[PDB]
Design a protein around this nucleic acid. Structure first.
Lengths: 205, 149, 76, 123, 113, 78
RNA sequence: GCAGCCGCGGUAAUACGAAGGGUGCAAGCGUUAAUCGGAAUUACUGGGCGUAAAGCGCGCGUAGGUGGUUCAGCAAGUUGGAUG
RNA sequence: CAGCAGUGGGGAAUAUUGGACAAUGGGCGAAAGCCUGAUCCAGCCAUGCCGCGUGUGUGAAGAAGGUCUUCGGAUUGUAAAGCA
């Protein structure tokens, strides 16, 4: 593997939020942010194609937490399945089990939804799945195992379900902490800061 | 045309008594994404004063391309000089799997299922004429053979 | 069950030699070429002549290198 | 010597579409100069009028279809090895006016079961 | 018909690494260790080792350190790769079957503080 | 003897058998005459345990082929 | 000293060797070797030969390759289906 | 030993003198069984390939140590040493 280390220094690069933080607030105030990662990022130039194709692959790949081994295989199961591989790439990243623990809201962000599925706290259909790559299917419960319920940062993570906006392709019973992966999203339910087809542009050079 | 796009810029030279006097040449394509494309060449001593002239001359000499809707009409072949260009249709999920100087002309005509390939010379000022003649010389229903097929 | 050839030799006792022409397609260039087979057949009545068009069928080997027999002379 | 006569049709046609000649006459033969019937049924009409007694010359009445002709590229013949003997793997260029076929039973194109020969496209 | 009577023969491409016959590395012994001078635009005093390879072949390899100690009968491994300045060398002595030393810190093939 | 016996497909600790009809002189993983259906000892829900195709097993037991001792105690599952 | 190519280095070095500080991709990561690709650079698909490499110095001719037109038959190539 | 393991040797380079016949073979037996380095398995090795592993949806307290003066600023830039 996972990216670990400094997560303040991540979000300057590409530009937006990317949701990689620590508590209850927002984006971009206590780490004095107006500038660029690099050797000297105080003068710029030439924000065009290849380096923005490679921003576009590497913006997605730092949200979800894949490395390029898994991510290039997600290009394979896009170009294998029929029709619209740019959206196929994003549905595969949204059916991911540590992504859904975020999209259900039982986890704080994805890198503590990765670490919450991995310590065997999430059940899918009455079992234990601890792989944060388990593709979930249309109509699976994604519940929480009943040994990690009274540990409060599970429940303390449930409040930005309302404050980040409703996801509106799950349903989640907060009484038993048990979601239901209702269906996969399509490319109007995902944020518009990403350019889905500029990863397909970064394949044959 | 409003999705302009530069292809190549070249520092060309000339000798006088004093020595090499320089001038920059830009080749630039201009389209609208719907089947209208011109290409333009211009020269100036500075880079952006020549790109402008390449934008200018490409907004005149534009051509209505008789496409099928996001693809080519039929697999075609064209050539200007030693440059030779094969273009065809693709199905629906493909993009512009051509490349280089053919990628710009087959982007600003609003095609996005190409699968084009160029042989012979790869000099982009003749590859651009050779793509331009393939696109100018198609017709889907304007067969004069008096039929429905 | 049958090949058909032109007799190209008679000079052996009780043995005739036919050429069986076949036009195969070339495996890479696609030209249809002539391509030849020179079999030995068994004419026990010793009566095929150089130039005869004959029909041969396949039998058990009658000599070394001789495993076809004469069926029927087509034309002469 | 002259030893491909229906590539001499398609060249006498092509060189007169390249000029603005009205009529092409040529001393050509039976059913593979009713390639000319196929080419100027699917296509247009002519008079086309094979007309003599012992030098039966056929006369394609080419016409010019507004501005610049409708035969752009024809030839694509076979004579040796240049060839189509296909089983459908035959031409589909626009899927239109496709490719004259020259084999065993009747000169046609793309309608019945199968069995290729050779010719070449209107456009 | 001309192609049918003799087809198109493809041209073989010889190796530009003739010694070490289809092998990644191949050890030899240093015949002689010396310096020679680069081709016309460049100028340095670049350390070569003429090595007698264990195939019986006898090639000149480059020593790409920042200072070495291949002392006239050492037992180097060589690998392919031309040095463009030195006319007529085709190999590099790899750095780590005998010696590696220095600072390098921006490593392989190197040493490890 | 022509014999009817099991051939190991599958993987390590996850066996899978094939009910081949072979020569009994051949190796147990190659050169069979036919394969009548499988047998799967680690089958679970959705996976069959045996598919033993009793019209060709009747042909070969007609021709005088020998089941082994497990194939004999798997054609008693009918 | 670098370097796969263009090439770098001769006094402010983004190319050589470094703590001021990070783009990869990660239990990997690099460079050697080999293989095909890009190579339409052996071109059948799909190339050329006045001047870039490339028309024998010219004939005549053996094998071969190819062959005008019409009616008929034939059914080896061709074509369709079936079966193995 | 061109059976398995292992040696010296060559070489850029490639393993354990292992366990059991428990399974599926095969061999003799009427059977019990007795054999079986086939095999099923354990060693060793990133050699491949797949998966996984290194606590917080925050906050100046902008600690030092690392700086240049852009002598306020950029730089570790919605970080920690607290934690439920």
């Amino acid at each position: 593997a996972r990216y670990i280390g400094p997560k303040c220094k991540l979000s300057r690069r590409e530009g937006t939020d990317l949701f990689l933080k620590s508590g209850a607030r927002a984006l971009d105030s206590k780490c004095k942010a107006e500038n660029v990662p690099g050797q000297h990022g105080q003068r710029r130039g030439r924000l065009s194609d290849y380096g923005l194709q490679l921003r576009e692959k590497q913006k997605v790949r730092r949200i979800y937490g894949v490395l390029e081994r898994q991510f290039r295989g997600y290009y394979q199961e896009a170009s294998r399945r029929k029709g619209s591989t740019g959206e196929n790439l994003l549905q595969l990243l949204e059916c991911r089990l540590d992504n859904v623990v975020y999209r259900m809201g039982f986890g704080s962000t994805r890198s503590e939804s990765r670490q919450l599925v991995s310590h065997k706290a999430i059940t899918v259909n009455g079992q234990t799945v601890n792989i944060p790559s388990y593709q979930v299917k249309a109509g699976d419960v994604v519940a929480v195992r009943e040994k990690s319920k009274n540990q409060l940062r599970i429940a303390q993570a449930l409040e930005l379900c309302g404050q980040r906006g409703r996801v509106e392709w799950v349903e989640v019973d907060l009484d038993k902490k048990a979601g239901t992966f209702k269906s996969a999203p399509a490319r109007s339910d995902l944020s518009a800061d990403i350019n889905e087809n500029l990863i397909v542009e970064l394949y044959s050079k | 045309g409003y999705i302009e796009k530069l292809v190549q810029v070249n520092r060309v030279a000339k000798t006088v008594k004093g020595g090499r006097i320089f001038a920059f040449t830009a080749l630039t394509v201009v389209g609208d994404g719907k089947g209208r494309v011109g290409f333009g060449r211009g020269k100036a001593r500075e880079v952006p004063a020549a790109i402008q002239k390449a934008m200018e001359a490409a907004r005149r000499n534009m051509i209505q391309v008789d496409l099928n809707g996001t693809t080519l009409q039929y697999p075609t072949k064209s050539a200007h000089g030693a440059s030779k260009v094969y273009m065809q249709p693709a199905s629906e999920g493909t993009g512009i799997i051509a490349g280089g100087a053919m990628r710009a002309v087959l982007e600003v005509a609003g095609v996005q299922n190409v699968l084009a390939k160029c042989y012979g010379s790869t000099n982009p000022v003749n590859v651009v004429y050779a793509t331009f003649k393939g696109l100018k010389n198609m017709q889907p229903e304007a067969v004069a053979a008096k039929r429905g097929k | 069950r049958t090949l058909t050839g032109r007799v190209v030799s008679d000079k052996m006792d009780k043995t005739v030699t036919v050429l069986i022409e076949r036009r195969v397609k070339h495996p890479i260039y696609g030209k249809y070429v002539k391509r030849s087979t020179k079999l030995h057949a068994h004419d026990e009545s010793n009566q095929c002549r150089i130039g005869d068009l004959v029909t041969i069928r396949e039998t058990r080997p009658l000599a070394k290198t001789k495993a076809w027999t004469l069926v029927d002379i087509v034309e002469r | 010597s002259m030893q491909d006569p229906l590539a001499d049709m398609l060249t006498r046609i092509r060189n007169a579409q390249m000029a603005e000649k009205t009529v092409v006459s040529m001393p050509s033969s039976k059913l593979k100069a009713a390639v000319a019937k196929v080419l100027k049924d699917e296509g247009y009409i002519a008079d086309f009028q094979i007309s003599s007694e012992v030098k039966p010359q056929l006369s394609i009445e080419l016409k010019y279809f507004e501005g610049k002709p409708v035969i752009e590229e024809v030839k694509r013949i076979s004579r040796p090895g240049l060839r189509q003997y296909k089983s459908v793997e035959q031409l589909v260029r626009g899927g239109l006016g496709v490719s004259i076929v020259s084999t065993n039973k009747g000169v046609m194109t793309d309608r019945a079961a199968r069995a290729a020969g050779v010719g070449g496209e209107v456009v | 018909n001309q192609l049918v009577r003799k087809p198109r023969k493809r041209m073989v491409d010889k190796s530009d690494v003739p010694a070490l016959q289809n092998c990644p590395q191949r050890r030899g012994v240093c015949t002689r260790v010396y310096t020679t001078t680069p081709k016309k635009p460049n100028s340095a005093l670049r350390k070569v080792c003429r090595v007698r390879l264990t195939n019986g072949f006898e090639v000149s390899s480059y020593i790409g350190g920042e200072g070495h100690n291949l002392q006239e009968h050492s037992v180097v491994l060589i690998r392919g790769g031309r040095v463009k300045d030195l006319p007529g060398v085709r190999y590099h002595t790899v750095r780590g079957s005998l010696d590696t030393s220095g600072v390098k810190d921006r490593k392989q093939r190197s040493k490890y503080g | 003897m022509v014999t009817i016996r099991l051939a190991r497909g599958g993987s390590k600790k996850r066996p899978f058998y094939h009910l081949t009809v072979t020569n009994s002189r051949n190796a147990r993983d190659g050169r069979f005459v036919e394969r009548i259906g499988f047998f799967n000892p680690v089958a679970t829900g959705g996976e069959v345990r045996l598919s033993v195709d009793q019209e060709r097993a009747t042909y070969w037991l007609g021709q005088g082929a020998q089941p082994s001792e497990r194939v004999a105690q798997l054609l008693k599952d009918a």
